[PDB]
Motif scaffolding. Sequence first.
Motif, short mmCIF file in Angstrom:
data_model
loop_
_atom_site.label_atom_id
_atom_site.label_comp_id
_atom_site.label_asym_id
_atom_site.label_seq_id
_atom_site.Cartn_x
_atom_site.Cartn_y
_atom_site.Cartn_z
N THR A 106 0.73 -2.58 -22.07
CA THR A 106 -0.06 -1.82 -20.97
C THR A 106 0.80 -1.82 -19.55
N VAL A 107 0.60 -1.09 -18.74
CA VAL A 107 1.07 -1.05 -17.34
C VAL A 107 -0.14 -1.37 -16.37
N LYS A 108 -0.31 -2.41 -15.82
CA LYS A 108 -1.12 -2.91 -14.81
C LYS A 108 -0.43 -2.86 -13.26
N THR A 109 -1.29 -2.89 -12.33
CA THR A 109 -0.95 -2.80 -10.93
C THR A 109 -1.37 -4.27 -10.51
N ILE A 110 -0.69 -5.10 -10.01
CA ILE A 110 -0.86 -6.45 -9.35
C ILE A 110 -0.23 -6.53 -7.76
N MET A 111 -0.74 -7.47 -7.15
CA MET A 111 -0.40 -7.71 -5.93
C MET A 111 0.26 -8.74 -5.68
N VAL A 112 1.68 -8.69 -5.17
CA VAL A 112 2.62 -9.78 -4.84
C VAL A 112 3.01 -9.94 -3.83
N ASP A 113 3.37 -11.16 -3.43
CA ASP A 113 3.87 -11.55 -2.14
C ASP A 113 5.34 -11.42 -1.81
N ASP A 114 5.60 -10.41 -0.89
CA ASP A 114 7.12 -10.03 -0.85
C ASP A 114 8.06 -10.96 -0.33
N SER A 115 7.61 -12.22 -0.07
CA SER A 115 8.19 -13.15 0.77
C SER A 115 8.82 -14.11 -0.44
N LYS A 116 8.21 -14.14 -1.78
CA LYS A 116 8.39 -15.23 -2.98
C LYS A 116 9.58 -14.85 -3.59
N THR A 117 10.21 -15.72 -4.07
CA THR A 117 11.03 -15.53 -5.18
C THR A 117 10.49 -15.12 -6.38
N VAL A 118 11.46 -14.67 -7.24
CA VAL A 118 10.74 -14.21 -8.55
C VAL A 118 10.00 -15.09 -9.69
N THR A 119 10.49 -16.54 -9.29
CA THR A 119 10.05 -17.79 -9.85
C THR A 119 8.58 -17.96 -9.53
N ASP A 120 8.52 -18.04 -8.18
CA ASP A 120 7.04 -18.31 -7.32
C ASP A 120 5.84 -17.05 -7.79
N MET A 121 6.73 -15.74 -7.85
CA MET A 121 5.79 -14.70 -8.30
C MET A 121 5.43 -14.75 -9.77
N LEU A 122 6.33 -15.21 -10.75
CA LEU A 122 5.81 -15.22 -12.12
C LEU A 122 4.82 -16.19 -12.33
N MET A 123 4.52 -17.48 -11.49
CA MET A 123 3.67 -18.18 -11.52
C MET A 123 2.36 -17.45 -11.49
N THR A 124 1.97 -16.61 -10.37
CA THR A 124 0.87 -15.99 -10.09
C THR A 124 0.53 -15.02 -10.98
N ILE A 125 1.50 -14.28 -11.60
CA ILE A 125 1.30 -13.31 -12.50
C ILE A 125 0.86 -13.85 -13.74
N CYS A 126 1.56 -14.87 -14.08
CA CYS A 126 1.16 -15.63 -15.46
C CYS A 126 -0.18 -16.16 -15.26
N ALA A 127 -0.52 -16.77 -14.22
CA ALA A 127 -1.89 -17.32 -13.92
C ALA A 127 -2.91 -16.45 -14.12
N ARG A 128 -2.63 -15.01 -13.77
CA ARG A 128 -3.62 -13.92 -13.81
C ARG A 128 -3.94 -13.48 -15.16
N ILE A 129 -3.04 -13.97 -16.15
CA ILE A 129 -3.22 -13.49 -17.41
C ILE A 129 -3.10 -14.84 -18.40
N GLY A 130 -3.60 -15.96 -18.03
CA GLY A 130 -3.80 -17.18 -18.59
C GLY A 130 -2.51 -17.84 -19.51
N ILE A 131 -1.26 -17.57 -18.95
CA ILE A 131 -0.06 -18.18 -19.65
C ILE A 131 0.23 -19.62 -18.91
N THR A 132 0.18 -20.44 -19.97
CA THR A 132 0.80 -22.00 -19.15
C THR A 132 2.23 -22.14 -19.17
N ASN A 133 2.89 -21.72 -20.35
CA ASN A 133 4.38 -21.76 -20.28
C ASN A 133 5.03 -20.53 -19.78
#
Length: 378
Positions: A106-133
């Motif tokens: 599915t395609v969701k819309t999420i809010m990301v901080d444009d100043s973060k690298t992809v690595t830090d962005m993936l943390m908050t994206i994963c947190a939003r969907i319950g992923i630890t790894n």
Amino acid sequence: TGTNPLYRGSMVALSLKISIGNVVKTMQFEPSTMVYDACRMIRERIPEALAGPPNDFGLFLSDDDPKKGIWLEAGKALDYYMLRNGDTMEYRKKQRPLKIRMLDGTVKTIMVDDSKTVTDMLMTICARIGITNHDEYSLVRELNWLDHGRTLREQGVEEHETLLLRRKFFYSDQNVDSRDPVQLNLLYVQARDDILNGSHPVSFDKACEFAGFQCQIQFGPHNEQKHKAGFLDLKDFLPKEYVKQKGERKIFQAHKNCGQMSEIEAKVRYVKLARSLKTYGVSFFLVKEKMKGKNKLVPRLLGITKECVMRVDEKTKEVIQEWSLTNIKRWAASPKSFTLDFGDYQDGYYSVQTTEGEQIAQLIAGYIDIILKKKKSK
């Protein structure tokens, strides 16, 4: 002639235009002002700067090439950024909407901080969907892996683009059970997409067995009256290498062989069949080798896993050679080559032509980083 009583010579302050939407306003800053204080002075002086809390805003220096626009770091001083009088800084909202295809498709819309690298962005994206790894996952552009160490903006990703969340490192696998059918569906969709897009290469026979389970899952039990010749859009059920073969009969046979199997049981068997293949969890790249006494370069497949690098014949997918990651002393990538130094565990380096050298190197370095983090926690 008039002389100006307000004249003050030898002033060092930077005079900068602060842009906030349609408002512009010139402000004076001492060159040694920390960015975080400049933000504070802007908040105390322009009403429009109160549109949101401070952590949602930062200072931004734009550029004709949007990829070269930069966000100022809070712990730097303005003079670090080589600013001149009359320059413009935007007090600009950091948050932006990102369209992202989740792991279920599915395609969701999420809010990301444009100043973060992809690595830090993936943390908050994963947190939003319950992923630890979260270290196992990454984003592809609509395999074009984004660079984890850089922001989206500086990689030329535009804000209208939809990005794909996808597992990149196959380090840790939990058991597959009907207990959480939502999780079971996630494991199924990822196994399936990898077979169908060819990043998990499989034989023609296996590809048809998989399609049989996929038919059971999408249509229910086989009905010879409706699931007859010509029913299937094969590009949705077979890797591209196998579509121009006449596999519809074999798919339908394996579909029939599921009998009355439930949707859930067919997802469990699909996942297990994928995990049972020698190719599971291996990332493959196409490289060109130099054979002893052979001016032409033999295409070969390079396999990467959490345990090893392997040389693999391009067709049969058999392992000619295998080195453990602990046996690799160094690696090097170039835009045309990839090279492996094995120390004493081999005479000579393994060097190959390829365009994906930088991507091979990032996969190897990522597995190592995951391993180092596991020991550090143990």
